Amino acid sequence: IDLDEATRTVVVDNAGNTTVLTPEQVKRGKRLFNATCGACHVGGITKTNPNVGLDPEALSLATPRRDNINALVDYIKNPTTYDGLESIAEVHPSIKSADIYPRMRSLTDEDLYSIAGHIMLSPKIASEKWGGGKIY
Amino acid sequence: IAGRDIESTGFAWWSGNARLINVSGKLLGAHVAHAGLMVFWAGAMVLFEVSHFVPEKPTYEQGFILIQHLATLGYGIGPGGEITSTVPYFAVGVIHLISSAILGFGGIYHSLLGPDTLEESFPFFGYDWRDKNKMTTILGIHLCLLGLGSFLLVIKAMYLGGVYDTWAPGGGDVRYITTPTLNPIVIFGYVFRSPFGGDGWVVSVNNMEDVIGGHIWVGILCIVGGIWHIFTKPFAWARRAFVWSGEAYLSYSLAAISLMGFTAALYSWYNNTAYPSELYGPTGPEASQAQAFTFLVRDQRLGANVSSAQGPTGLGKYLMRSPSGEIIFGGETMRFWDLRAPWVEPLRGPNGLDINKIKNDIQPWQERRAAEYMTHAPLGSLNSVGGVATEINSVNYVSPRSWLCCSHFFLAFFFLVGHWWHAGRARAAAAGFEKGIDRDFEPVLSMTPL
Amino acid sequence: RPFSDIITSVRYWIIHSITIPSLFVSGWLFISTGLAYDVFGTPRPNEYFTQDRQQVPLVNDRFSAKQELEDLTKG
Amino acid sequence: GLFDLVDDWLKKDRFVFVGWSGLLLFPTAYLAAGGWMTGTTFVTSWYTHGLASSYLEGCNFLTAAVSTPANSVGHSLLLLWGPEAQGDFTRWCQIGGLWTFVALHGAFGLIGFCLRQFEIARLVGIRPYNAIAFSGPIAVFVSVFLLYPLGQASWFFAPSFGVAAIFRFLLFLQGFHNWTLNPFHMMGVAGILGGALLCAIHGATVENTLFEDGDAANTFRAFTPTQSEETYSMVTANRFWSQIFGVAFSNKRWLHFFMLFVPVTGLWTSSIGIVGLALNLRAYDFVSQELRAAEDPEFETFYTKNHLLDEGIRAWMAAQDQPHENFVFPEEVLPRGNAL
Amino acid sequence: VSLWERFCAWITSTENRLYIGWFGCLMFPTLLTATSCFIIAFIAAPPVDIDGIREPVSGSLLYGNNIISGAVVPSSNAIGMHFYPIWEAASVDEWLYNGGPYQLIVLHFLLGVSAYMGREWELSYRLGMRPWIFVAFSAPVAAASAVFLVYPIGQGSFSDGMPLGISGTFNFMLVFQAEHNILMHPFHMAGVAGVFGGSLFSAMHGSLVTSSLIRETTENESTNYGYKFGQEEETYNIVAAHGYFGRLIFQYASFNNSRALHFFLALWPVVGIWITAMGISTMAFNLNGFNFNQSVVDSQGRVINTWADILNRANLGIEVMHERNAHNFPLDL
Amino acid sequence: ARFANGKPQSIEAKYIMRSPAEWDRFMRFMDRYAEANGLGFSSXXXXXXX
Ligand code: CLA
Ligand code: CLA
Ligand code: CLA
Ligand SMILES: CC1=C(/C=C/C(C)=C/C=C/C(C)=C/C=C/C=C(C)/C=C/C=C(C)/C=C/C2=C(C)CCCC2(C)C)C(C)(C)CCC1
Ligand SMILES: CC1=C(/C=C/C(C)=C/C=C/C(C)=C/C=C/C=C(C)/C=C/C=C(C)/C=C/C2=C(C)CCCC2(C)C)C(C)(C)CCC1
Ligand SMILES: CC1=C(/C=C/C(C)=C/C=C/C(C)=C/C=C/C=C(C)/C=C/C=C(C)/C=C/C2=C(C)CCCC2(C)C)C(C)(C)CCC1
Ligand code: OEX
Ligand SMILES: [Cl-]
Ligand SMILES: [Fe+2]
């Protein structure tokens, strides 16, 4: 089995529209995610706050929905709590807190799009370990 | 070739450098060339790290080992441990490279074309391994040089731009140490205190004032000793307990340097003052304290009454009491209650961890620092997988503290072994039975039976 | 004849510069052409799973192992 | 006679001794080595263990192995012409016949090597102690690679010829049999460590009691093979060790016999223990302590902690170690301690 | 003739049944107190809390233990790396509750073995022999120091040291595997190679020497009786043994300078044990072995398990169970 | 315990009594070695002259 066209299609928006990630995008993401996100979100789990995981099920229950590329990209632009009552940009990496966190001082849009695509795509490949944890 | 063959010498090719014991000029050439090798490595590695530098990541995530030293000296570093520019590191690297070229040429010249023995032509640089006055003279000269170097560090920290101080008000930054501590009692309290937990023989220096004062004292002591050994001659009590030969001096130096290597290895693993966590990453205990702190904060946000929740064993899972009564973080990290970090001290009162400060006056930057330190603990693997041994390999990080400590501990023990070997051989050779027994004067046959 | 004498012989290297590289290149082409996958039955990186089965292809019987493997290794 | 000149040519003096034992030593040993070399390079373990064990699939030297055949096959010989494979080299490799090939050929090569030692001793006219010493490794191989899987369900539970596979075997036996608690293993480790001790101490003692037989610092060149007198002072070494330790050797023959004896008997005791494990007759529990802990939840020793570790390793390892059982353990079923 | 002189002389005498020497002045009292305390504690030491969670563990014979399960439990986790002599406790009972005897015994044992090395060298000097046996003995001393002192220093607590017992040793080894992956560390591999090679070379050297023994005895008398203490000629034939060894493997491959042979015998296990002690010391500061977890990936991206992943599975099984009540947070730092 | 401490003397009695042992040794050592100023052997670890 390959990383074919069927398995590279992910939700792009709330509606449900589904775009396709080019293989280059996949690579760049896996790189960017491992370089910046990996230290705390290795394996699709949140190391500091294990309750708020990164698996698609938890993203589906966040407020608002975080199970599509657009909402993940917006979350990077402007992060909120699990219920979305207030912003936690001062305690989470974000473009809004670019001054606080120097890592994002260079990230571009495509970079964010590729990172979100990787986050969306990895549970389609592994399908049980993205956010699973030790057990799996 | 007279001096370079197992016949003329009696030393095999593998132990070939021992042929230089009685050859003065060639030994000097070898020493100088080796020093040139050291300088070359320093310059080359600094240039390598500057080339592979990435401004996004902190230095302790890039696998760097030398930028941290020059940053601690106060070169191209801003408040909070941010790196501004990498030009001074490049300058240091190139200067070291050029000086290494000069030293290497000198070593080669003295090893190849230089006179084999310096005693005949230059009766000032010639020695005998057996007279004590010249040995003590050389020792005193180099001791004065070391004292001048310690002075130079003090001068750099006091009037040449200052040094980086983590405990500085408003965060870590470069400052001038205006008032170093000169009290002999406080300075030698480090030297004469216990090496066990809670004491930290010389590793437990806290502020920069103590560092500067200790260096002033070391420089003064080294200058005085260097002057004294130059003038005087070894006394009677030291004249009959020491073996006076080149290999014996080498063995003494080996023992001393093994002790120094052990000290530096354990010093890089525990110290936050001369090894700021913003450059070398958090220490062993620091990561554990950061984990306990960040989970305490997270559970406090939910509204749980911290310092009132009994742990699974009934001991208290957030706040405990130290065996001395101080209030500390609970869990397995109670073994690390001796920790003192710049981001946790604001919360400490005379009684320990103040509770009113924790409940009300918490800061977001402390949360970020604790999360970053917990996410970057001095854990890793030989292939630098990073994290716990059971973790999958996505991150790529091993803390420079681990590298420094492990490498220098290994080197220190093997130099202790070198001390054992060389001390034994030097004493046997001085006695005169390093080659065999005798077969006609076997001392066992002359001793009473038993 | 001792080893060193043979190793330093020129007539040895004139028969060890047309034999060794040829053998090395043949060993390279053994898997460059992909023959080794078929000879030993090891799966290629894209043959571990198929569209029909998404789990490990274990053998459960003994005297029908041939047919079972033939089926598993269908696609 | 035709037999006589053939025997003469077999015992011809050359670079390597062939002998009668060579006839089954060389082909069997060569085939075993070649089977291991091809196994860790091309053939896979996908269809027997659900693993990847080969350089072709991306494993390094530490992870490549020749894995045991599938558990569905029992203790079958997995002959290439057997009913399980019926020729067809590819399926023979896939179901795991290469493990049996390597094991059987290596065992016969091992027999050939012991026979070769006997024949060399007879030709040179010395006593055959070398074969008796080599009987130890033969016992270890027979007990671990042959008897243990034979006592178990199938060849699947024998150790696999690989670096990491042997580590898995170690951990598996510790978790399932409490092999460290077995007294025969304790005897084996005592024998092995004592052998290493004896080797190091004898080397140091001999090298540090050399006689003055030269004038150079290099003492290696003061020895000639055709020497009659002894090169080191037995008297001085004996006195030194009797003054330091309290007891010392005074008989070179007894010294070297002891050096022979220690590791061999260690290995033999370990082999007896492994043969015991093959039937699940393991020294697992201390009944008295197990009880007294069961009736009182305050009693604790390191022994009970080891038991907890064994239960954890067993429960967490069974699912992936034995894919043929189709073990499915939900998260709430797996034993786990606190937050960690 | 002064008194000091007379003493110094008796001390450095080589006619005493056991050599005292100046290093003996440190070795004897220290080892004697260590062994006295060990013998008493192995019989009648009360339970000790090792994890500092008020869950004492019994390790004494009089508390329902046997020889194998019994041990001298290391000091409490609450103490950590702090020095805990008798006089710092408020009562002897409390000192026993927090595992002070472990610290006492281990510190004295380390000083004693160091002084033992020194005494070996000193007697070598007195007897006029070449002084390198204590260099060989350094390897076990280094291993003991790494397992008893360096590892607690790196981990930050004396509770992490090896308990003085059998089952305690096994527990220490298993937890070390779980938390550090000792097996996949090249230094442990070097140590296993060194120990196996030491046993191999010991057995082979003994067999070769005993096989080629000059016939100087009957059949109804121990072969060992042919040799007489204080001989002047070799009781064994090097030529026959070397002929057998060369015919067994290869002609080139063989040692003749018996001195080189014995040096190699000394060199192999010693360097192996040194490298192993360095493995333990390096891993005390969390430089673990190779982690080849999920290294093999198919085209799609799914992970294909290797033999290393089953090792990780067993390590997880051990890890989630060790010190069940001690942990409160997800990471073991 | 963790109270730093010059050496580990906490009570003047402890220092004043760790004193006489070292001074006793100094005296017994001085008994042999006294009135020594010269006698330079000038050799490799000889110290032959008493
Ligand atoms: C830092 C390592 C070091 C140093 C400084 C030396 C130095 C020396 N060794 Mg030596 N040695 C070493 C490692 C070292 N060794 C090691 C590792 C071994 C074990 C293999 C030996 C084994 C050994 C033996 C057996 C002998 C020496 C001897 C000597 C001395 C004379 C060498 C000589 O005549 O060179 C002659 C060699 C050459 C002329 C060829 C080398 C050409 C140059 C020097 C190489 C470097 C060029 C450099 C890259 C160019 C830089 C130019 C600069 C302007 C930038 C000299 C003092 C001899 C001695 O005792 O002297 C009395 C001797 O007999 N050594
Ligand atoms: C400043 C430190 C220092 C100095 C000046 C010396 C000086 C000397 N030592 Mg020495 N030694 C030292 C430290 C030192 N030692 C230490 C720390 C040890 C403990 C291991 C020893 C152990 C030792 C022994 C056992 C012997 C000496 C001997 C000697 C003499 C001859 C050495 C020679 O020709 O080298 C020759 C150099 C070589 C052959 C190089 C060998 C390379 C080593 C084995 C591997 C290095 C690995 C390296 C870390 C990384 C490898 C990279 C690789 C993977 C590519 C000479 C006086 C000999 C003697 O007695 O002379 C009188 C002797 O027999 N030394
Ligand atoms: C002397 C060397 C030697 C030895 C001892 C063995 C031994 C073995 N090989 Mg083997 N092998 C060898 C050389 C050797 N091999 C060589 C050189 C090759 C390369 C061609 C192979 C290739 C090979 C393969 C490919 C396989 C083996 C296998 C085996 C094992 C089972 C063999 C079997 O059942 O047949 C036993 C055969 C005999 C006992 C025949 C002996 C000769 C008879 C007695 C002559 C008289 C018979 C007569 C004609 C019959 C009369 C009629 C009858 C009705 C009475 C066994 C351990 C198999 C294995 O291990 O699978 C797991 C397997 O598949 N071998
Ligand atoms: C005696 C002897 C020896 C030794 C020798 C020695 C040790 C030497 C050294 C040498 C050396 C130690 C050298 C060095 C050199 C250096 C150099 C030559 C440098 C150069 C530099 C440069 C060219 C630079 C450039 C640059 C710049 C300026 C900028 C940036 C870029 C770059 C970096 C490019 C041996 C062992 C061999 C053998 C025996 C004898
Ligand atoms: C810088 C600094 C510091 C320091 C300072 C100081 C001031 C130091 C010093 C140091 C010192 C001050 C040291 C000393 C040492 C000593 C020693 C180490 C000794 C040794 C000795 C010996 C080794 C001897 C031997 C012997 C004997 C015992 C017997 C007889 C013989 C003989 C003589 C051989 C501090 C930490 C504060 C802080 C930071 C900075
Ligand atoms: C099984 C089988 C068989 C057989 C086969 C063969 C016999 C093969 C062989 C093969 C071989 C016979 C192979 C080999 C290979 C080899 C190799 C692959 C090697 C490699 C090497 C290396 C890699 C090395 C390394 C090293 C070391 C070890 C040490 C030092 C360093 C170095 C790095 C050099 C037959 C046909 C009967 C058919 C049936 C099946
Ligand atoms: O104490 Mn003995 O084992 Ca070293 O990791 Mn943490 O702490 Mn406890 O857990 Mn895992
Ligand atoms: Cl914890
Ligand atoms: Fe021997």
**B164: three-class secondary structure by DSSP:** strand
Pick E3's closest partner by Cβ from F1, F2, F28. F28
Structure tokens at A86: 């207030």
What's the first-to-final CA gap in chain A, in angstroms? 22
SS3 readout for chain E: CCHHHHHHHHHCCCCCCCCCHHHHHHHHHHHHHHHHHHHHHHHHCCCECCCCCCCCECCCHHHCCCCCCCEECCCCCCCCCECCCHHHCCCHHHHHHCCHHHHHHHHHHHHHHHHHHHHHHHHHHHCCCCCCHHHHHHHHHHHHHHHHHHHHHHHCCHHHCCCEEHHHHHHHHHHHHHHHCCCCCHHHHHHHHHHHHHHHHHHHHHHHHHHCECCCCCCCCCHHHHCCCCCCECCECHHHHHHHHHHHCCCCCCCCCHHHHHHHHHHHHHHHHHHHHHHHHHHHCCCECCCCCCCCECCCCCECCCHHHHHHHHHHHHHCCCCCCCCCCCCCC
> What b/e sequence results for E192-209 when a residue is b if at least 16 CB atoms lie within 10 Å of its CB, and e otherwise?
eebbbbbbbbbbbbbbbb
Structure tokens at A104: 């994002």
Structure tokens at A110: 């495509």
CA dist., res. A63 & res. A58, Å (int): 10
Output the CA B12–ligand 2 centroid distance in Å. 13
**What are the backbone dihedrals phi and psi of residue B349, each rounded to the nearest 5 degrees, phi first?**
-110, -175
Amino acid at A93: P
Check: CB of residue D133 under 8 Å from CB of residue D261. no
Structure tokens at E290: 């190779």
CA dist., res. B60 & res. B377, Å (int): 11
CA dist., res. A42 & res. B397, Å (int): 13
Half-sphere exposure of D223 (CA within 13 A, CB side): 21
**Which string of DSSP letters, residue by residue, matches C18-59?**
SSHHHHHHHHHHHHHTTHHHHHH-PPPTT-SS-SS--S----
B98-to-B37, B104, C1 alpha-carbon distances in Å: 12, 10, 53
CA dist., res. D80 & res. D72, Å (int): 17
CA dist., res. B292 & res. E328, Å (int): 9
The owner of tokens 């205190």 is: B193
Which residues of chain E from 201 to 260 reach within 8 Å of chain B, CB to CB?
A: none
Chain D residues closer than 8 Å to C3 by CB: none
CA dist., res. B383 & res. B389, Å (int): 11
CA dist., res. A123 & res. A126, Å (int): 5
C-alpha angle D103/D105/D107, rounded to 5°? Answer: 65
CB-based contact B12 D209, cutoff 8 Å: no
CB-based contact E4 F28, cutoff 8 Å: yes
Nearest to B43 by CA among B97, B1, B113: B97
- From C20's Cα to the closest Cα of chain A, the distance in A is 37
Output the CA B400–ligand 8 centroid distance in Å. 24
The residues near B394 (Cβ < 8 Å, ≥ 6 apart) are A34, A38, A42, A43
Considering every ligand atom shown, identify the ligand nearest to the alpha carbon of residue B253 and give its number.
Answer: 2
**Strand B348-349 with B352-353, pairing:** antiparallel
CA dist., res. E103 & res. E116, Å (int): 20
Check: CB of residue D230 under 8 Å from CB of residue D145. no
| Closest approach atom of ligand 3 to CA D79 | 61
F28 touches chain E (CB under 8 A): yes
Beta-bridged to residue A9, according to DSSP, are: A20
Beta-bridged to residue D65, according to DSSP, are: D162
Number of Cβ atoms within 10 Å of the Cβ of D27: 14
E316 touches chain A (CB under 8 A): yes
Chain E residues closer than 8 Å to C53 by CB: none
Chains E and D touch (3+ CB pairs under 8 A): yes
Structure tokens at B120: 């005949």
By CB neighbour count within 10 A (0-12 exposed, 13-18 middle, 19+ buried), where does D88 fall? Answer: middle
Check: CB of residue E98 under 8 Å from CB of residue E53. no
**What are the backbone dihedrals phi and psi of residue C15, each rounded to the nearest 5 degrees, phi first?**
-115, 5
Q: At how many degrees (to 10) do helices E186-211 and E238-248 cross?
A: 130
Nearest to D284 by CA among D188, D174, D187: D174
CA dist., res. D310 & res. B390, Å (int): 17
**A36: three-class secondary structure by DSSP:** helix
Nearest to F40 by CA among F49, F32, F31, F30: F49
CA dist., res. D133 & res. D218, Å (int): 34
CA dist., res. E332 & res. F8, Å (int): 35
Output the CA B191–ligand 5 centroid distance in Å. 8
Considering every ligand atom shown, identify the ligand nearest to the alpha carbon of residue D84 and give its number.
Answer: 3
Please compute Rg for chain D using Cα positions: 26
CA dist., res. D310 & res. D316, Å (int): 10
Chains E and A touch (3+ CB pairs under 8 A): yes
B338-to-B283, B342, C46, E317 alpha-carbon distances in Å: 13, 13, 55, 32
Chain D residues closer than 8 Å to C37 by CB: 56
CB-based contact F31 E4, cutoff 8 Å: yes
Residue nearest to atom 36 of ligand 2 (CA): B15
Residues of C with CB under 8 A from a CB of D: 31, 36-43, 48, 56-63, 65-66, 69-70, 72
Please compute Rg for chain A using Cα positions: 14
**C17: three-class secondary structure by DSSP:** coil
Chain E residues closer than 8 Å to C46 by CB: 298-300
Structure tokens at D184: 């025969």
**B131: three-class secondary structure by DSSP:** coil
The pocket around ligand 3, CB under 6 angstroms, is made up of: D 24, 27-28, 31, 77-80, 97, 100-101, 104-105, 108
Number of Cβ atoms within 10 Å of the Cβ of C17: 10
Output the CA B280–ligand 8 centroid distance in Å. 24
Chains C and F touch (3+ CB pairs under 8 A): no
- Our separate counts of H helices and E strands in chain A read 5, 2
Output the CA B48–ligand 1 centroid distance in Å. 27
**What are the backbone dihedrals phi and psi of residue E231, each rounded to the nearest 5 degrees, phi first?**
-80, 165
> What b/e sequence results for B344-358 when a residue is b if at least 16 CB atoms lie within 10 Å of its CB, and e otherwise?
beebbeeebbeeeeb
In the 8-state DSSP scheme, what is residue A6? G
CA dist., res. B242 & res. E188, Å (int): 39
Chain D residues closer than 8 Å to C42 by CB: 42-44, 46, 54, 56-57
Which residue is closest to B398 within chain A, CA to CA? A39
The owner of tokens 């070494």 is: D237
CA dist., res. E160 & res. E180, Å (int): 13
The owner of tokens 């510790």 is: D174
Output the CA B39–ligand 4 centroid distance in Å. 9
- Solved by what technique? cryo-EM
C51 touches chain A (CB under 8 A): yes
Amino acid at E137: F
Number of Cβ atoms within 10 Å of the Cβ of B164: 24
Structure tokens at C13: 């290297």
CB-based contact A2 C46, cutoff 8 Å: yes
**A80: three-class secondary structure by DSSP:** strand
| Closest approach atom of ligand 5 to CA B242 | 34
Beta-bridged to residue E190, according to DSSP, are: none
CA dist., res. B198 & res. F4, Å (int): 8
Q: Given ligand 4 and candidates B97, B103, B110, B112, which is best to mutate, with the most ligand atoms within 8 Å of its CB?
A: B97
Chain E residues closer than 8 Å to F1 by CB: 82-84, 88
The owner of tokens 């000889």 is: F46
Structure tokens at B215: 């260096």
Structure tokens at E29: 């009292």
Beta-bridged to residue A19, according to DSSP, are: A10
| Binding partners of C (≥3 Cβ pairs within 8 A) | A, D, E
Output the CA E300–ligand 3 centroid distance in Å. 44
CA dist., res. B291 & res. A50, Å (int): 13
CA dist., res. E110 & res. E156, Å (int): 19
Cβ B188 under 6 angstroms from ligand 2: no
Number of Cβ atoms within 10 Å of the Cβ of B309: 13
**Which string of DSSP letters, residue by residue, matches A83-121?**
S-SSB-GGGS--STTTTT-GGGGS--HHHHHHHHHHHHH
| Closest approach atom of ligand 3 to CA D100 | 62
B397 touches chain A (CB under 8 A): yes
**What are the backbone dihedrals phi and psi of residue B432, each rounded to the nearest 5 degrees, phi first?**
115, 25
> What b/e sequence results for A13-26 when a residue is b if at least 16 CB atoms lie within 10 Å of its CB, and e otherwise?
eeeeeeeebeeebb
- From B93's Cα to the closest Cα of chain E, the distance in A is 29
Check: CB of residue B271 under 8 Å from CB of residue B265. no
The structure was resolved to a resolution in Å of 2.9
Nearest to D172 by CA among D18, D316, D340, D11: D316
Cβ B111 under 6 angstroms from ligand 4: yes
Check: CB of residue E102 under 8 Å from CB of residue E74. yes
Half-sphere exposure of E209 (CA within 13 A, CB side): 23
Structure tokens at B24: 């003065």
| Closest approach atom of ligand 5 to CA B213 | 40
Pick B437's closest partner by Cβ from D212, D214, D217. D212
Cβ-defined contacts of B185-192 (< 8 Å, 24+): B185/F6, B186/B210, B186/B213, B187/B213, B187/B214, B187/B217, B188/F6, B189/F4, B189/F5, B189/F6, B190/B214, B192/F6, B192/F7
CA dist., res. B312 & res. B299, Å (int): 16
CA dist., res. E50 & res. E325, Å (int): 12
Structure tokens at D122: 């007879």
Beta-bridged to residue A10, according to DSSP, are: A19
Output the CA B125–ligand 5 centroid distance in Å. 29
Q: Given ligand 4 and candidates B108, B109, B110, B116, which is best to mutate, with the most ligand atoms within 8 Å of its CB?
A: B108
CA dist., res. B153 & res. B219, Å (int): 10
C-alpha angle E304/E309/E314, rounded to 5°? Answer: 150
**Strand B173-175 with B163-165, pairing:** antiparallel
The owner of tokens 């190139």 is: B94
